[PDB]
Amino acid sequence: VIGDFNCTNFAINDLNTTVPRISEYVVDVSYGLGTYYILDRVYLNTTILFTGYFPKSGANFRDLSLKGTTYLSTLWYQKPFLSDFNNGIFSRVKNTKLYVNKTLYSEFSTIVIGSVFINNSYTIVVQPHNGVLEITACQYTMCEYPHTICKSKGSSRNESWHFDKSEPLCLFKKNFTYNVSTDWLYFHFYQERGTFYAYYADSGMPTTFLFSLYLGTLLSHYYVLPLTCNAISSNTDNETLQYWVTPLSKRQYLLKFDNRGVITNAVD
Numbered sequence: 511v512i513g514d515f516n517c518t519n520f521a522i523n524d525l526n527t528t529v530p531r532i533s534e535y536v537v538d539v540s541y542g543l544g545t546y547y548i549l550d551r552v553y554l555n556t557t558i559l560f561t562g563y564f565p566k567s568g569a570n571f572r573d574l575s576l577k578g579t580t581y582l583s584t585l586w587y588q589k590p591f592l593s594d595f596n597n598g599i600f601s602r603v604k605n606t607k608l609y610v611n612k613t614l615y616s617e618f619s620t621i622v623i624g625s626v627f628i629n630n631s632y633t634i635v636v637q638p639h640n641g642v643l644e645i646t647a648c649q650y651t652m653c654e655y656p657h658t659i660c661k662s663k664g665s666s667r668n669e670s671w672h673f674d675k676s677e678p679l680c681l682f683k684k685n686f687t688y689n690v691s692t693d694w695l696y697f698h699f700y701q702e703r704g705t706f707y708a709y710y711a712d713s714g715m716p717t718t719f720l721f722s723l724y725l726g727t728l729l730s731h732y733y734v735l736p737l738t739c740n741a742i743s744s745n746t747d748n749e750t751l752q753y754w755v756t757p758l759s760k761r762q763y764l765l766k767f768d769n770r771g772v773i774t775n776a777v778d
């Protein structure tokens with residue numbers, strides 16, 4: 511289970527549907543993908559040695575996305591899917607693009623980052639809403655079996671990942687835009703000296719600072735929520751979710767900046 515709140519007993523089973531698939535693709539930082547722009551700094555026309563929270567060059571990713579129809583498996587809410595956060599993660603996220611009539615809708619898995627996922631502790635939630643990325647850190651009463659839905663093509667489930675009827679205490683709450691036409695989003699989520707840091711991109715480039723938040727407490731776990739949908743399968747659209755993850759470590763990189771201050775190259 512994720513949290514301890516019994517939000518539902520509708521269509522729960524114990525089926526071993528899948529395990530996290532390993533990417534044929536590997537971390538290749540040679541053009542700055544898997545790096546980030548350093549906070550609010552600009553570096554121009556120079557090479558920097560920077561020790562940051564970076565993925566290991568040549569590492570694989572695990573796809574942690576789960577697509578459901580009606581049933582949720584209890585085995586989805588355990589290791590290997592419920593994961594130790596350690597220093598942090600680099601995410602490569604497929605923007606799943608669905609069409610209703612001719613209109614584009616953007617879907618991808620919500621990620622939650624926390625410790626025990628009980629409402630006496632802060633859970634960071636990063637959730638798409640069709641070109642809006644809602645980010646919160648809010649003492650959520652997380653469900654035992656949390657999931658999101660396709661709002662575009664619908665689900666046989668109501669959306670359910672927390673049960674807070676009154677608004678819970680928030681440390682952070684902000685919305686960021688992203689380009690709904692993209693193929694990939696990239697994220698860094700890491701922690702240092704009790705502060706959480708988030709970065710994102712939506713084009714295959716070094717990530718840009720979203721926010722940072724002082725927690726003091728270590729984040730110990732993360733979990734990519736299942737998404738339940740009547741679409742996103744071979745019998746309906748041949749579309750897929752993908753939420754690829756690889757661990758960060760405290761690591762020295764060479765970063766090369768051009769005269770525009772763009773990271774054109776990096777070395778692990």
Ligand SMILES: *[C@@H]1O[C@H](CO)[C@@H](O[C@@H]2O[C@H](CO)[C@@H](O[C@@H]3O[C@H](CO[C@H]4O[C@H](CO)[C@@H](O)[C@H](O)[C@@H]4O)[C@@H](O)[C@H](O[C@H]4O[C@H](CO)[C@@H](O)[C@H](O)[C@@H]4O)[C@@H]3O)[C@H](O)[C@H]2NC(C)=O)[C@H](O)[C@H]1NC(C)=O
Binds near residue numbers: 629674
């Ligand atoms: C922060 O997060 C916590 C933890 O998730 C929330 O606390 C839980 O809140 C729910 C909802 O109120 C609690 O569920 C209710 O528990 C009552 C007490 O349980 C009795 O029975 C058990 C049987 O094992 C005994 O262990 C216990 O001692 C009691 O004798 C029930 O009376 C309630 O019954 C209602 O719901 C059930 C279905 O669940 C129906 O069958 C009943 O007819 C009735 O409608 C209910 O089950 C839960 O116990 C709390 N957990 C803990 C650990 O305290 C907080 O609410 C949340 N805080 C905020 C501010 O959001």
Ligand SMILES: *[C@@H]1O[C@H](CO)[C@@H](O[C@@H]2O[C@H](CO)[C@@H](O)[C@H](O)[C@H]2NC(C)=O)[C@H](O)[C@H]1NC(C)=O
Binds near residue numbers: 516518519
């Ligand atoms: C989780 O909550 C559900 C919904 O309240 C519980 O289901 C009820 O269980 C009682 C006792 O068996 C039944 O009389 C009700 O008819 C059930 N309602 C529904 C809608 O199914 C469920 O038992 C709870 N499970 C746990 C592990 O707490």
Ligand SMILES: *[C@@H]1O[C@H](CO)[C@@H](O[C@@H]2O[C@H](CO)[C@@H](O)[C@H](O)[C@H]2NC(C)=O)[C@H](O)[C@H]1NC(C)=O
Binds near residue numbers: 644684685
């Ligand atoms: C951030 O984005 C979300 C998603 O668009 C906003 O949530 C909506 O807010 C309105 C007004 O409160 C509600 O009527 C909708 O039902 C909400 N939608 C969802 C999916 O929850 C949210 O208000 C935005 N703003 C901030 C500051 O978080």
Ligand SMILES: *[C@@H]1O[C@H](CO)[C@@H](O)[C@H](O)[C@H]1NC(C)=O
Binds near residue numbers: 529585
């Ligand atoms: C699920 O099935 C795979 C393939 O047989 C196996 O490797 C894995 O250990 C199983 N997991 C569980 C929780 O049974």
Ligand SMILES: *[C@@H]1O[C@H](CO)[C@@H](O)[C@H](O)[C@H]1NC(C)=O
Binds near residue numbers: 555769
């Ligand atoms: C960039 O740096 C190189 C090496 O120092 C230098 O030759 C070049 O003139 C610089 N260009 C600009 C636009 O500053």
Ligand SMILES: *[C@@H]1O[C@H](CO)[C@@H](O)[C@H](O)[C@H]1NC(C)=O
Binds near residue numbers: 689692693713
């Ligand atoms: C959005 O993404 C698509 C595909 O990567 C790209 O062609 C387009 O130029 C992008 N538009 C904006 C405003 O970023």
Ligand SMILES: *[C@@H]1O[C@H](CO)[C@@H](O)[C@H](O)[C@H]1NC(C)=O
Binds near residue numbers: 747748
């Ligand atoms: C999905 O792809 C398979 C293999 O190409 C094909 O048999 C099936 O008809 C396709 N279905 C849809 C809805 O595209």
